[PDB]
């Protein structure tokens, strides 16, 4: 029973060789935009720019496949947070709503009680932490506390935390808020591995987990009734060397009865309207400013006089000195 | 290229929208503005029928209409208040006779639909009398009364005001000039006051529970003052709702909601990131 869907897609990697994470985030962004989630309901945060990176062989393009088949970075991408503003503090503020008062509506997550929220986070992680731009970390405790605040304020109906990183299962080991189901690309002891090495572009395009998540989501339509179990079974150990994991005890509904579209897409309710309201010569011209008024520029600042100590100050200093001199010499 | 659309939106707003929103202004402040979006295309391509020589938008295709146009609509970054978008769509010459169909498949009389909490879209077909001339673009001067009737009905439906449910053997009076009957405003204000008080209560309870659970949240003097204002306003609003003064109760509930939201969502609450408790020994042992 939800009527609203929000998506926060975060890339936490801030260097050119980390092309995989930007491509993953952009691919998930394109998937959730096809499945009907508006871009105004997507808070897309990319830690670095790869489409217009100067080292990109093909400018203004981010590619998902080895032979330049699909360009996830199209022409209708809305990047809310980019470069140095994608930090742990900024992400926590976006999640918990404690954002600076001047932040525009584009960079906020205005999610209601009835809202199902999808969190996709890809980057470099470890045992209980996901590194943000190789300088800061979001621990499992911090993310659990943020999600708990989100629950207590009643700002999500159900949360889908997808993480694609090394030891990805360690992030949701400390989740205690209800109605949260989390997906990991690897267990606590495994490491996430890349996919599609591309010599022409010069980097690794995407990760196996996100690539196969896209492949599974390319068969998903609004009419599709695929449950979350099939998402749980994507990329078995045969393809992903690391074994993906999940937790569903916090979720109050059986995953067999939960549709993937409930988190990855939103259809709008439409009601046909059948009601009507039954209405019944300034003389002085204007001038452009002179661009370089040298004469005015020179004389706007008053003449520069060499600084000298105040006469009162020097008199007082000398008076004190002679007073001490007489008090010493009698 | 084939349509030159001119609408007297200024006069329509002055004569109808502004009196309507002056009547409805008991619930808050209203901002009205308009724009003309050129080359704004509906996502779904209408289906053609060879018999009626007209194009249709099926009911199942309606939900996908409003998503592509929202990108051209924008985000309205100037303010954070809720936005109600009321689009008037003039179909292209390719599908000039565009009609919206209901569940039964019959055309909609108003040729419009509204989406909850978003707004409404009305398809404005142009008469063939204008097309009688072969010169293009043809001047399209839309009728503001017919459009504004549908838009104001959609506004009433969106704001929760519905068709009055008459008791058996009762006759209801005719519509007023504004379009809203005053007792409906009273019901809306009752609902708004109750919802505001419930929201403020939930916000204050959540703030207290957050403070109890997490011990690195900073509570400034401003936050404390806002919490005190919110509590006082909630108590006053409850007292006035018990007494019977709806206007004072509404104002108190609005102040309570504002204060509680300011206290709870203050950026100062999140001051520093977590410092691990299993690493403080490395901070205090070496010197102390």
């Amino acid at each position: 029973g939800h009527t609203n869907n929000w998506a926060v897609l975060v890339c936490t990697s801030r260097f050119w060789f980390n092309y995989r994470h930007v491509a993953n985030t952009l691919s998930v962004y394109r998937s959730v935009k096809r499945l009907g989630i508006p871009d105004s309901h997507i808070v897309l945060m990319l830690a670095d720019d790869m489409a217009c990176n100067p080292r990109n062989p093909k400018p203004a393009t981010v590619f998902s496949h080895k032979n330049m088949e699909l360009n996830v970075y199209g022409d209708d991408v809305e990047v809310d947070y980019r470069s140095y503003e994608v930090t742990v503090e900024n992400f926590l503020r976006v999640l918990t709503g404690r954002i600076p008062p001047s932040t525009p509506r584009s960079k906020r997550l205005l999610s209601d009680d009835r809202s199902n929220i999808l969190i996709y986070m890809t980057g470099h992680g470890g045992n209980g932490f996901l590194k943000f731009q190789d300088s800061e970390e979001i621990t499992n405790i911090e993310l659990a506390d943020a999600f708990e605040q989100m629950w207590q304020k009643r700002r999500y109906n159900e949360l889908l935390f997808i993480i694609d990183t090394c030891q990805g299962a360690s992030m949701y080991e400390r989740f205690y808020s209800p109605n949260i189901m989390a997906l990991a690309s690897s267990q606590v002891g495994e490491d996430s591995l890349s996919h599609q090495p591309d010599p022409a572009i010069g980097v690794h395009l995407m990760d196996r987990y996100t690539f196969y998540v896209l492949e599974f989501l390319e068969e998903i339509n609004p009419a599709s009734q695929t449950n979350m179990n099939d998402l749980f079974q994507v990329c078995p150990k045969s393809l992903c060397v690391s074994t993906p994991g999940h937790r569903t005890d916090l979720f109050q509904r059986d995953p067999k009865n939960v549709l993937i579209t409930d988190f990855f897409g939103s259809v709008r309710k439409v009601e046909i309207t059948t009601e009507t309201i039954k209405l019944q010569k300034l003389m002085e011209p204007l001038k452009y400013a002179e661009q370089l008024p040298v004469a005015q520029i020179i004389h706007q600042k008053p003449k520069l006089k060499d600084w000298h100590p105040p006469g009162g100050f020097i008199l007082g200093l000398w008076a004190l000195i002679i007073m001490v001199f007489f008090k010493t010499y009698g | 290229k084939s349509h030159d659309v001119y609408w007297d939106i200024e006069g329509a707003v002055r004569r109808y929208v502004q009196p309507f929103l002056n009547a409805l202004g008991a619930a808050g402040n209203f901002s009205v503005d308009s724009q003309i979006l050129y080359y704004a295309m509906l996502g779904v391509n209408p289906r053609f029928d060879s018999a009626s020589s007209s194009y249709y938008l099926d009911m199942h295709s309606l939900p996908h209409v409003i998503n592509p146009v929202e990108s051209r609509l924008g985000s309205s970054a100037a303010s954070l208040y809720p936005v109600l978008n009321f689009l008037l769509y003039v179909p292209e010459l390719a599908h000039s006779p565009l009609y919206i169909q209901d569940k039964d498949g019959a055309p909609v009389a108003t040729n419009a639909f509204h989406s909850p909490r978003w707004g409404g879209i009305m398809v404005y077909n142009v008469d063939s009398k204008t097309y009688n001339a072969s010169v293009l673009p043809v001047r399209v001067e839309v009728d503001m009364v017919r459009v504004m009737e549908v838009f104001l009905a959609q506004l009433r439906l969106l704001f929760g005001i519905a068709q009055p449910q008459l008791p058996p053997k009762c006759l209801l009076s005719g519509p007023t000039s504004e379009g809203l009957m005053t007792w409906e405003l009273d019901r809306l204000l009752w609902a708004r006051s109750v919802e505001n008080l419930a929201t403020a209560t939930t916000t204050l309870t959540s703030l207290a529970q957050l403070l109890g659970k997490i011990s690195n949240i900073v509570i400034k003097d401003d936050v404390a003052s806002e919490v005190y204002k919110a509590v006082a306003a909630v108590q006053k609003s409850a007292e006035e709702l018990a007494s019977g003064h709806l206007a004072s109760a509404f104002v108190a509930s609005q102040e309570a909601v504002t204060s509680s939201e300011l206290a709870f969502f203050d950026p100062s609450l999140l001051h520093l990131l977590y410092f691990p408790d299993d690493q403080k020994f490395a901070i205090y042992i070496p010197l102390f």
């Binding site: 470099h124 992680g125 470890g126 970390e137 030891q167 | 020994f281 490395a282 070496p286």
Partner: peptide
């Protein structure tokens, strides 16, 4: 993969505490 910042408790805290306490106080 990566490394978070963690204190070297055995390596340095023990060394820099046993450089003070047994050198000055206890004996």
């Amino acid at each position: 993969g990566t490394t978070q910042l963690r204190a070297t408790a055995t390596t340095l805290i023990l060394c820099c505490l046993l450089i003070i306490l047994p050198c000055f106080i206890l004996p």
